Amino acid sequence: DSVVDLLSYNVQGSGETTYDHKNTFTLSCDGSLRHKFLDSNIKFSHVEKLGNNPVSKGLLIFDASSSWGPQMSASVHLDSKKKQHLFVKEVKIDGQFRVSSFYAKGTYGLSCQRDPNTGRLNGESNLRFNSSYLQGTNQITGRYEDGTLSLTSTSDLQSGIIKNTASLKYENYELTLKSDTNGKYKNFATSNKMDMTFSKQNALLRSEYQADYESLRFFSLLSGSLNSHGLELNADILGTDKINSGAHKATLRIGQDGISTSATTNLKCSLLVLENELNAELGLSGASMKLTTNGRFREHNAKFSLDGKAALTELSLGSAYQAMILGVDSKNIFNFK
Numbered sequence: 165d166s167v168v169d170l171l172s173y174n175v176q177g178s179g180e181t182t183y184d185h186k187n188t189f190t191l192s193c194d195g196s197l198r199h200k201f202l203d204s205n206i207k208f209s210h211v212e213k214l215g216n217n218p219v220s221k222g223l224l225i226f227d228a229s230s231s232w233g234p235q236m237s238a239s240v241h242l243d244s245k246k247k248q249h250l251f252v253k254e255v256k257i258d259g260q261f262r263v264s265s266f267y268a269k270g271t272y273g274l275s276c277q278r279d280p281n282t283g284r285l286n287g288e289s290n291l292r293f294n295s296s297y298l299q300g301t302n303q304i305t306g307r308y309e310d311g312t313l314s315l316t317s318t319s320d321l322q323s324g325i326i327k328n329t330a331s332l333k334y335e336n337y338e339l340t341l342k343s344d345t346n347g348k349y350k351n352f353a354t355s356n357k358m359d360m361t362f363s364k365q366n367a368l369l370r371s372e373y374q375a376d377y378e379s380l381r382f383f384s385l386l387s388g389s390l391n392s393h394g395l396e397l398n399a400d401i402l403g404t405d406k407i408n409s410g411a412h413k414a415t416l417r418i419g420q421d422g423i424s425t426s427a428t429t430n431l432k433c434s435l436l437v438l439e440n441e442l443n444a445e446l447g448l449s450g451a452s453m454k455l456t457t458n459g460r461f462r463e464h465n466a467k468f469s470l471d472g473k474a475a476l477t478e479l480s481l482g483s484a485y486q487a488m489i490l491g492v493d494s495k496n497i498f499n500f501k
Contacts, residue, residue, distance in 0.1 A: 174198035177206075187215030203229040220244040233264040251278045268295040283310030299323045325349055338363050351378050366391055380405045394418035408433050422447030436461045441469075450475025464489050 166172050180192040195206025205227040213219040222242030229235055237260050244253040253276040261268040273290040285308040293300030299322060307314040317330040326349070331342040339362040347354035353376035361368040369388030374381065385400040395418040403410035412429040423446040431438040436459070443454035453472035458465065466487045473480040483498040
């Protein structure tokens with residue numbers, strides 16, 4: 165208490181906390197701060213029925229008011245009760261925020277219904293957010309039924325410029341996930357759809373995606389299946405445009421019989437075409453390698469390929485190439501064992 169305003173204020177708060185031996189509990193926390201630039205109102209009530217009827221009530225009362233524009237407030241309403249034997253819970257949370265003109269509001273709503281006799285639960289979630297330059301909203305539905313879960317997610321991002329949806333299912337001790345995301349920005353028609361699967365031993369990988377930018381339709385395919393007996397993976401990716409087309413495929417098998425790799429790259433550019441084939445098998449009969457490459461431009465042809473076998477009994481590598489480039493006869497052979 166002083167003649168000067170800024171030197172005068174109020175600061176106080178009661179943090180009451182008491183448990184009733186009756187198996188009932190109550191928590192009270194009051195916050196009130198009085199100052200010449202800001203005015204804070206804080207009050208939170210928390211009470212728990214620790215005897216019978218396991219009810220839980222939680223309420224927050226908060227309001228702070230700066231005397232120089234900014235105004236803030238948030239409310240929390242926690243409601244959980246055992247309706248006879250149906251456990252009913254509902255939560256309402258809302259945080260509201262402005263400064264002078266900037267806006268920021270996020271409202272959330274959660275609903276949960278459970279039947280423990282049947283081991284079944286119904287979870288429903290609502291999310292919405294708004295601001296001066298940002299819009300956010302998402303919904304989640306969770307269905308659990310006595311060991312069986314069915315969860316689904318739908319997300320809208322910045323007014324839906326990007327759309328994402330995730331589907332998950334876990335039944336019979338085997339997991340399956342599906343996940344999709346798609347772009348709606350500028351010239352990008354990007355769309356990725358991802359699914360994952362799981363068995364007692366096997367996990368399966370399928371991944372698709374298309375970029376589809378301007379005139380370029382680029383595609384990537386990945387297929388990965390695994391087991392106790394090594395991996396089998398194929399990566400297949402295509403980049404095709406108005407004229408040019410990047411086409412390469414790679415196949416890799418990890419088997420107890422040995423390793424078989426097959427990476428192939430074919431490129432065509434108007435009057436130029438390129439073809440590339442490597443073929444290596446790392447088996448038990450000596451490593452086998454086979455190569456092929458014939459780059460074709462206009463009429464001119466270059467024809468190359470190489471055979472190769474490396475066995476303990478014998479090593480065989482025979483190289484050959486021929487071409488008529490600029491009409492110049494050209495041929496080389498290298499055979500040696």
